[PDB]
Design a protein around this ligand. Structure first.
Ligand SMILES: [Mg+2]
Ligand SMILES: [Mg+2]
Ligand SMILES: [Mg+2]
Ligand SMILES: [Mg+2]
Lengths: 225, 136, 63, 386
RNA sequence: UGAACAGCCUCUAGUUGAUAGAAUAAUGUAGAUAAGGGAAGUCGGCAAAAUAGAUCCGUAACUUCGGGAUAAGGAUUGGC
RNA sequence: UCUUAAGGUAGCCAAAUGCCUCGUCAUCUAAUUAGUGACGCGCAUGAAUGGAUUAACGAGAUUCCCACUGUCCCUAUCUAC
RNA sequence: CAGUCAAGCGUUCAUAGCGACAUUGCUUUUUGAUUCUUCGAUGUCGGCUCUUCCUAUCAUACCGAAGCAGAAUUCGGUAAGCGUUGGAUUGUUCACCCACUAAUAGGGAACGUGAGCUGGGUUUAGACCGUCGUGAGACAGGUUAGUUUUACCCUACUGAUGAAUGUUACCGCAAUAGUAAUUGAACUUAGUACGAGAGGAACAGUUCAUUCGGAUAAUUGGUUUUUGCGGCUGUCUGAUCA
RNA sequence: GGGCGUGUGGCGUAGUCGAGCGCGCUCCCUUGCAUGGGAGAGGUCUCCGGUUCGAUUCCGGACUCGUCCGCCA
């Protein structure tokens, strides 16, 4: 399933939510339908944490997540950090990042094995990503889009990239990430695919205005069947 | 703001009246935006309609590309440079006035934002938070 | 609460006190008062202003 | 002809006339409505405004964007020594309104309350209530006939109380005396409570408690004669205006051939009695206690007084009320704090408030330190300290 | 001091005359400063602000070839 | 071809000269009864009643731009008298 | 501006909404008509500022009707409590566009308001052009430049004292007078009711905001004769210190 | 703002209730200082309703264009 969901009318689910294999994060100011989608589809096996990052309802663009670790900005308060430490399982590691770009979901596009980052990140932050997430890192842009997290949706099975992407960039990124990539649109043609939707190994959640060919492209590239 | 607001906004000290020229932060090829109107502003005799951070305004491109000049379009203020108070009581300000171009529903005409944006704007507009590099 | 440090003088900043300034290169400065804020805007070097923590650390004062 | 552009009226017509108040202590024009089921308690209290400070607390509003997040708010401090009960009075109700019929005083009156009955205290024989105390020290003869008179009549019982001005840093020495309504029990229970509490002190926590919405009645800060531009907020006339520009241009039409009362004019600004409602109590502090300024999260033993004392006031050695926001009147002024005239739910009047940190830095400048121990620890040793 | 019988301070000389005392309300007259915006004010940038000396670089259209021109636009300036 | 002494030539223009008129087209602006460039059956332009052009100059009249600012949003404060 | 009658329009159907041919009125925010008052002078444009009043109600409150399924809209009632904006052009009233808004309703008060301002226009004397005139000169034709005086009196209004009520002091009562709050958005209800679909509400609840008002100065900003501290120029006190 | 009149082929223009000519150019014929001739195409008669049997034609409404008259001191 690519599950049709709105955040109070918003068809961008990746902005307000962060979904990994092991956990899920949702914003505190959410509707009953928005919570019920993650509660029904994810089930009781996977914890869902209602969280606020840096005083903001936006959490997907603020944080970058992995099954092994979670990265939070510097502006995240101690109460939010302690609540995430209690609510999250003991396996994941939560570490604050002290870096100027500070919006880790926009900066970092990552999965379990390999990650794409903004080219201009600091070397200490790159080593921190490689340490906490245990993930090999490449500094690359998707056809000149420096915000790889906003302009790519990535999982273990496959990836969706920006629609206006050069084909040469598509095989280059596909060989670099060792996963097949498809250029496509989400939410009735919105270009920002990573902000448009969240995905993991068995679930994808998207906006209600995402059309049927777009949803078919999603389930084909992410192998959710 | 008005239609495309995702939630409400606390009152930010108004810093951009009508006639203000702010930098154009996105990559749409426009250089500055000239504010002619503020969405949702009230009516008082002699009072100029002023804008704050996170507000949607009506603006014209005074300097930039000729297909963007000589027409009115909606814009969103992302940097204010007039100091305002949050409910945790810090007084903060950027060093320039800056906004981006959008449609009336709020999605950006451009694709990337240079420089910081305010969290009071990023929470209120998700497309701005999507294309934003750093949110403070 | 959190007690922040002055970006110019190193003084302790209590909640609701002073100002904050986000520069165009996305760097955050925090000023405890208008005196240190105005010295920052006048572009003085805190290594040469005699009452700052960075000056006293440089000059080994009070050790 | 008609006004070309509409605009709202400058100023509020219900706060007229903007004259000086009759006294420096504002009158309580209305008390909370009585019901004869609760125990006998006062409806109000007297204190002295000391100054303002900030706090940090965790906001609890289920639905706000700042839910479960720290906010910093401005509070004002009212120094409240325990008030001394001297006297009760009863009011019968006539077709021309309420009317007092008797007043029964306490026996021993202190000097600070009997200074209220004098303009030249230093040259006096101090003969005040001397024949009244001579009416006392019999068995009961001239006393409980007036008390049973208040029981037999007098549908409203009010208590004469007076502050303890000598416990405050004020240099006045002459206490303030007031009537406070009792709002519990029957008439006999009210006057029995008063008779038992003659010459006794009543503390502020007996009448107030935390998270209670109260009203402040006080006379505002005076400003003397003021022009129309700041007194009423009218628009300044343009720069090239002959004969001045802080004025109102048209003060009326040709007809009616008089200046109307509704036209804004120059005169006295400030020193008006005001009643400001719905102020939440954050802390009822005890003066017989160190760590008044400490919370459960801060836990550093410091009193509520800032560094260098409150500016123009001094110390807070007595009990106090920390109340949210601004109240009318300036520092060192008598202020009457009153219970609310109605029950407010509002999901804001019912919020339970627990403070996290209280500011005790100096208000006589940009204070950097909360305690002298913290200042000494930060700055190290000085030349004056050996 | 400075280009200077400019402005500012001083020497010789000459005055110390102009009803005074006490307070510091409004509105004035004269002098000033203002966060953010920058003519949205107004018939109209009225009024005010900005620029300013000197040295070096650089200087357009047009022209009656004489000019425009300090065009515009940049950099520097103390003490030892 | 008539009328008359002869019939407005060269130029110029909604010009300080155009009633209609806020003329029509273009440009300038988000929007212009303003400005500029064109057009000309021009109420009622026009050749020492001087026509057209014109560098430099102007306490002359008008429009736009940059800088600048309490002119203004929206007022506040200080000094002397 | 409002009625009465109703041939017709409205698929059908006079009157949901309109309504010809006729006819009865109201108003004095149009312009006329008249010449009563003023020629030993009542300051004739417009704008700015400010108060109050009227309702023939643009919006907001509660309702009735529909050619009212919902959404949007139209007609009407009680209603003047409350609001009715920012600009480009023009001296304008008016107009015309841009834009926001719940809405950008109409008017009066000596065509409100010049000892309140301004002086762009008109409306002196200078000057230019066109037309007219032999000419001096004329032109609600165009253009440019053109002194805006006085309040200290009475009343009114805003504030401030105050004799006399045996004296003086404290605490009170309340006749009368005034009065104040206003409007919107988002989430949810709910893609629900309704509908064939396109489309698409409302009540209760929550969080904010606009306009207004009354205070206040903990914080932030402004202000500086704290001439408080430091720096700098020129000159003077022989230098130094000051 | 109001009044009065106007609207035909690509262009100009004739119309009494029963759309023609000229100009542009389609073709053919015809020939210096480039003509002429013959067959062509070309309209929702500004639009919408009613009358008639049928309206360019009669009527009503709307649009459009062109004239005339209109603010103040
Ligand atoms: Mg105005
Ligand atoms: Mg008027
Ligand atoms: Mg009106
Ligand atoms: Mg202070």
């Amino acid at each position: 399933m690519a599950t049709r969901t709105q955040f109070e009318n918003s068809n961008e689910i990746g902005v307000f939510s962060k979904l990994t294999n092991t956990y899920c994060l949702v914003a505190v100011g959410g509707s009953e339908n928005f919570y019920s989608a993650f509660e029904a589809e994810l089930g009781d096996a996977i914890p869902i944490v209602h969280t606020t990052i840096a005083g903001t309802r936006i959490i997907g663009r603020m944080t970058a997540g992995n099954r092994r670790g979670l990265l939070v900005p510097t502006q995240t308060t101690d109460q939010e950090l302690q609540h995430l430490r209690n609510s999250l399982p003991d396996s994941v590691k939560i570490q604050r990042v002290e870096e100027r770009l500070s919006a880790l979901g926009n900066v970092i596009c990552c999965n379990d094995y390999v990650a794409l980052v903004h080219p201009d990140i600091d070397r200490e932050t790159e080593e921190l990503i490689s340490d906490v997430l245990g993930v090999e890192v490449f500094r690359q842009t998707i056809s000149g889009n420096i915000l790889v997290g906003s302009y790519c949706s990535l999982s273990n099975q496959g990836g969706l990239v920006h629609p206006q992407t050069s084909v040469q960039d598509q095989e280059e990124l596909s060989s670099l990430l060792q996963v097949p990539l498809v250029a496509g649109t989400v939410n009735r043609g919105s270009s920002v695919v990573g902000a448009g939707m969240v995905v993991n190994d068995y679930l994808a959640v998207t906006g209600l205005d995402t059309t049927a060919p777009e949803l078919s492209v999603i389930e084909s590239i992410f192998r959710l069947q | 703001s008005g239609n495309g607001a995702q939630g409400t906004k606390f009152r930010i000290s108004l810093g951009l009246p009508v006639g203000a020229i702010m930098n154009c932060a996105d990559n749409s090829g426009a250089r500055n935006l000239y504010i002619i109107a503020v969405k949702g502003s009230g009516s008082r005799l002699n009072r100029l309609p002023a804008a704050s951070l996170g507000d949607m305004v009506m603006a014209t491109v005074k300097k930039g590309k000729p297909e963007l000049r000589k027409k009115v379009m909606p814009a969103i203020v992302v940097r204010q440079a007039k100091s305002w108070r949050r409910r945790d009581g810090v007084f903060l300000y950027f060093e320039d006035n800056a906004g981006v171009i959008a449609n009336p529903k709020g999605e950006m005409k451009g694709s990337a934002i240079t420089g910081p944006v305010g969290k009071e704007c990023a929470d209120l507009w998700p497309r701005v938070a999507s294309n934003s590099g750093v949110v403070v | 609460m959190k007690v922040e440090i002055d970006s110019f003088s190193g003084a302790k900043i209590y909640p609701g006190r002073g100002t904050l300034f986000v520069r165009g290169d996305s760097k955050i400065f925090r000023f405890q008062n208008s005196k240190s804020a105005s010295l920052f805007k006048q572009r003085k070097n805190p290594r040469r202003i005699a009452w700052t923590v960075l000056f006293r650390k440089h000059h080994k004062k009070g050790i | 002809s008609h006004r070309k552009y509409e605009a709202p009226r400058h100023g509020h017509l219900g706060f007229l006339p903007r004259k000086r108040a009759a006294s420096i202590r504002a009158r309580v024009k209305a008390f909370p409505k009585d019901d004869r089921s609760k125990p006998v308690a006062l409806t109000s209290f007297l204190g002295y405004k000391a100054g303002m400070t900030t706090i940090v607390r965790d906001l609890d509003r289920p639905g706000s964007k700042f839910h479960k997040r720290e906010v910093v708010e401005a509070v004002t401090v009212v120094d409240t020594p325990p008030v001394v009960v001297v006297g009760v009075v009863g009011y019968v109700e006539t077709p021309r309104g309420l009317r007092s019929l008797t007043t029964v005083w306490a026996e021993h009156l202190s000097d600070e309350v009997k200074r209220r009955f004098y303009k030249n205290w230093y040259k006096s024989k101090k003969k005040a209530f001397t024949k009244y105390s001579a009416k006392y020290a019999q068995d009961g003869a001239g006393i409980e006939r007036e008390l049973a008179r208040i029981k037999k009549y007098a549908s409203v019982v009010r208590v004469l109380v007076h502050t303890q001005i000598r416990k405050t840093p004020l240099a006045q020495k002459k206490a303030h005396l007031a009537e406070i309504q009792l709002n519990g029990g029957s008439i006999s229970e009210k006057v029995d409570w008063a008779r038992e509490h003659f010459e006794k002190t009543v503390a502020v926590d007996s009448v107030f408690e935390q998270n209670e919405m109260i009203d402040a009645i006080a006379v505002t800060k005076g400003h003397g004669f003021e022009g129309v531009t700041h007194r009423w907020g009218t628009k300044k006339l343009p720069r090239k205006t002959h004969r001045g520009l802080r004025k109102v241009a048209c003060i009326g039409a040709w007809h009616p051939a008089h200046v109307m009362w509704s036209v804004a004019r120059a005169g006295q600004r400030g020193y008006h009695s005001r009643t400001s409602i719905n102020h939440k109590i954050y802390r009822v502090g005890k003066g017989d206690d160190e760590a008044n300024g400490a919370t459960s999260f801060d836990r550093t033993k410091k009193t509520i007084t800032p560094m260098g004392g409150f500016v123009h006031y001094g110390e807070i050695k007595n009990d106090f009320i920390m109340v949210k926001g601004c109240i009318p009147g300036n520092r060192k002024r008598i202020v009457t704090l009153r219970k609310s005239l109605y029950t407010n739910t509002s999901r804001k009047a019912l919020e339970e408030v627990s403070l996290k940190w209280i500011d005790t830095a100096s208000k006589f400048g940009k204070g950097r330190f909360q305690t002298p121990a913290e200042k000494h620890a930060f700055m190290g040793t000085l030349k004056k300290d050996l």
